[PDB]
Amino acid sequence: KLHSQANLMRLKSDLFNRSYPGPTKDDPLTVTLGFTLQDIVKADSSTNEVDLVYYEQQRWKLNSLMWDPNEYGNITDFRTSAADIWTPDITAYSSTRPVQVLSPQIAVVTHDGSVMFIPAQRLSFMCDPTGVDSEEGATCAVKFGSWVYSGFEIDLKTDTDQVDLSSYYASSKYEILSATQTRQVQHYSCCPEPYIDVNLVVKFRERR
Amino acid sequence: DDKLHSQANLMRLKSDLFNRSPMYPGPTKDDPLTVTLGFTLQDIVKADSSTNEVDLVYYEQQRWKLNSLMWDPNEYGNITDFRTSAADIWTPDITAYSSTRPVQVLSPQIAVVTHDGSVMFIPAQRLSFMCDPTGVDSEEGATCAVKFGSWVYSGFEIDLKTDTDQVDLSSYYASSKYEILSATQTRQVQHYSCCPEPYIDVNLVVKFRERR
Amino acid sequence: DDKLHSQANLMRLKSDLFNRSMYPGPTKDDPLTVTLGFTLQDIVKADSSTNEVDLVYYEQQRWKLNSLMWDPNEYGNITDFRTSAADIWTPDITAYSSTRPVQVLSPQIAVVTHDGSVMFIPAQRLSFMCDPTGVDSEEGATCAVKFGSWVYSGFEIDLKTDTDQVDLSSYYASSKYEILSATQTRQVQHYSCCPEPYIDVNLVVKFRERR
Amino acid sequence: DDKLHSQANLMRLKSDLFNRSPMYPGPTKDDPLTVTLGFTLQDIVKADSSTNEVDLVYYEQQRWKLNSLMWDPNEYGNITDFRTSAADIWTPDITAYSSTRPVQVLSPQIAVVTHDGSVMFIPAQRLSFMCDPTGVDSEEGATCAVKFGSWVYSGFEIDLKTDTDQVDLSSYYASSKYEILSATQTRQVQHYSCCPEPYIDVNLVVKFRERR
Amino acid sequence: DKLHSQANLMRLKSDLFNRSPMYPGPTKDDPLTVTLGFTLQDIVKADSSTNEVDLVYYEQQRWKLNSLMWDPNEYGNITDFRTSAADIWTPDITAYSSTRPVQVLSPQIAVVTHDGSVMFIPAQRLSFMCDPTGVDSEEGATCAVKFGSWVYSGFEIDLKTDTDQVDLSSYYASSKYEILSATQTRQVQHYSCCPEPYIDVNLVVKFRERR
Ligand SMILES: O=[N+]([O-])/N=C1\NCCN1Cc1ccc(Cl)nc1
Ligand SMILES: O=[N+]([O-])/N=C1\NCCN1Cc1ccc(Cl)nc1
Ligand SMILES: O=[N+]([O-])/N=C1\NCCN1Cc1ccc(Cl)nc1
Ligand SMILES: O=[N+]([O-])/N=C1\NCCN1Cc1ccc(Cl)nc1
């Protein structure tokens, strides 16, 4: 038991403290994103901002984070501070305030080199809630992707194209009629290369 | 005089603890840990019916114990405990599951360690969480619930326990806008899409209502 | 040119005091007394839909440490210095009923004297639990908030006051609120959770809309 | 395999640039620098007529080129550019001259450095600035303006250029409370009382009105 | 060439900051005069439900340290450079009646000149204690706020102004409020804590609604 601690000490150390500069064209990366929507907190129709609370599942895999669990006392994974590893700069493209982080910044690293990171967020973004008081509700959309890596450096994937609604707050002012998450491709004025985003479409209405 | 000596003893202990074998990497399946959580509810500051957020101020008592923090008192001039900045040691990642704003810390981040390896930490906090206050202006009032638990450690790494099911109300602000009808704290199990492993929370349930 | 010396004398004084030895805060074996006093500058806002009131004040904090003494003759005849608060231990004095983190309004800089005595006067803005009922009347409203160490009991940190009158002499003469009285009282209690004494200084303020 | 080689190649280059001859100390009259700026306006979020403040969301393409940042790709695995944290390199101190709050940064602080030593950095921001929204509720709309430029570097040390004088509006939020009649960005010169030497800014003028 | 100018700048910066480490601030034996001049950009809001007013302004700060002198000849004819304000000591100039932490609007970069003189001009937003009554009248309202070192007596930091007129030449022409006048005047203050006097510059602004 004092042994196992020492094994993990040794592996963090081997991993971090002696031997990654982000993805490149030669060494591209695939980040998988899934959203879990917890609450539409507020719809401000005097500014067309909507605040959402959700979490965002991120998963990716680095060869430099691999190890053999036999060399390390059968450790298959460990938890770690997100600052000790590279994380992807997944950004919402139409936010109107800096994202508020609601969960501790810790990730999970597995022996095959995959990393899982699940930050919870409050986000204000651009959305006209006209018709939220109608049957068909209002429809808002926000794109998420790397701000600086093109699609030849960071690819994006979803496991499914439904947002996760299974922990949506049942007593929220808004109900969700539908929530999808879909990969897309864009070009930006700066650059030849296309950029990848995952677009959250959310349809919602005042609970009544 | 012996003042200088007890000062040296404490610095020596601290450095024996921290700068030898060091910083403990958190709990694992092989080395699990039980955190005892307890809440002291001070005030429901605000209940916003247009967003269904409620704002609470409370102290969250966290208690755990690590082998790596044991020492013998007679070896350090009979020091039985000490205060230390929370940045100095490992602390658990206890998170409200339905917050809507980051938590605002109202007390200094200092814990107490005791020779037997236990640690105490009582952050005071202000939390906004998801809560529909319908009914708060009635006799029955309203009821809300928010879970607390590690965000990244399953039940096999961090288990949670309470000392009692009853929220401490003996410091509840007597002139709050809202009075407290009941407030309990009960351990639960949850599952999350990412993982087969069970996650543990303490669910805080508060029934409250406008003061007359 | 005496001015390069004075300056080296001071830097040397810093080294010798900071990285030599080293202070871990107070203990049962080596307790400390902190003198506090409040200077109330303004009641800024009284919100009666949430029962919070915002104060602006600064707090005089004084204490004395042996680890902090020096002979001035060995250091240029330097008798005192200004130093960043991050460089020295400071007491963890907290309000016990805040509703928002305190916002800090003055430099975190303290003054250290050769006898080990330290002086520090943080100016702060505080929201705390307070029902302003009756500010709009002649008797006014009463509020209270205690301050004390959050983690040290009276066996490690003792508080004293010089007066039980809050200093109102720089109170803002055009506040939305007049002060009718403002007192600060040392209190000792036991919380039978635990057998050792606890000390706080209870700020009691009486106030009404300015007329 | 070569994936590990290309990784090592980058590690090497970054090291080679970033510790020697390290932190290049900014532009000087002997060694001035040109920054090209272009704005992409996304949204007018709020126009407050009780305080005369307007809140914009935009991003700002910034480009410049340093000698100290050149390299031969052939000497580095044919690496022709790389992403890097904005803190590891000098970046220009372009500020809004009439903001009323600190700018909130919306995008990560990361830049792209090419082998000829050109750098590109595109921070997205939320700005409150001095603007009388009078007229916004009419056909004619309101006109506002905000100068951007170095705070401390005169036009002998930093020049500004634009590629076009038209703000890019192809990402303007289509259902904003405000529509854009026109948005231009124009290089200007200015003096301040501190200093004899003129300074450069790029003036963002926007004409806009409530959508109907 | 430009390789040499950079070489030289880098050498010089290394010499001041390293080579003779970090300057302990001013003392009774090494005192310091800071010149201050305000430029008022905008009165943004005047809140009469709390008597707070928000100003946007910049504050010109000059002082001179002997330990910042160099001979431009040893150093490639570099007469000045810009530098991050964290690489150097700066004065802790603080508003005495602020009700919020000051928000900084400009980058924190100073200019250092070879005679050892430093210019630093931070832009800020400030909320301070001010009763805006009369603002809608012809006479307008009048508010004042004091600025100066929070911890250094006049024997360590003295202040002076170049003129008693606040610079209005950049006042925002479409502000909710016009300025009828604006002065800055050096004063000498005594606090309870201290025998020694503290110096401050008093900002008196008289203002009203635009019409
Ligand atoms: O021209 N662009 O707008 N580019 C752009 N907009 C949003 C993200 N993005 C790509 C980008 C590319 C390079 C850098 Cl330094 N930043 C951003
Ligand atoms: O899919 N999940 O929501 N997982 C999850 N939600 C709250 C806590 N939790 C488990 C978890 C597991 C691993 C990481 Cl890296 N983050 C979070
Ligand atoms: O006299 N000034 O107002 N100068 C000035 N105002 C805005 C930008 N600027 C130039 C300047 C020059 C030097 C320093 Cl340290 N700061 C600012
Ligand atoms: O007794 N005082 O209020 N002193 C005081 N108030 C505002 C500034 N000032 C001087 C001072 C002197 C020393 C320390 Cl540590 N802080 C402040």
What's the topology here?
The structure is a homopentamer.
Chain A: H1 2-17, E1 29-44, E2 49-61, E3 77-81, E4 90-92, E5 100-101, E6 106-110, E7 114-117, E8 120-126, E9 138-146, E10 154-157, E11 174-186, E12 195-206
Parallel strand pairs in A: 1-10
Antiparallel strand pairs in A: 1-2, 2-7, 2-8, 3-6, 4-9, 5-8, 6-7, 9-12, 11-12
Bound molecules: the ligand O=[N+]([O-])/N=C1\NCCN1Cc1ccc(Cl)nc1 (4 copies).
Question: What is the structure about, briefly put?
Answer:
Chain E: GO terms for molecular function: extracellular ligand-gated monoatomic ion channel activity; identical protein binding; metal ion binding; transmembrane signaling receptor activity. The structure is a homopentamer. Chain A has a single domain, classed as Acetylcholine Binding Protein, Chain: A (Distorted Sandwich).
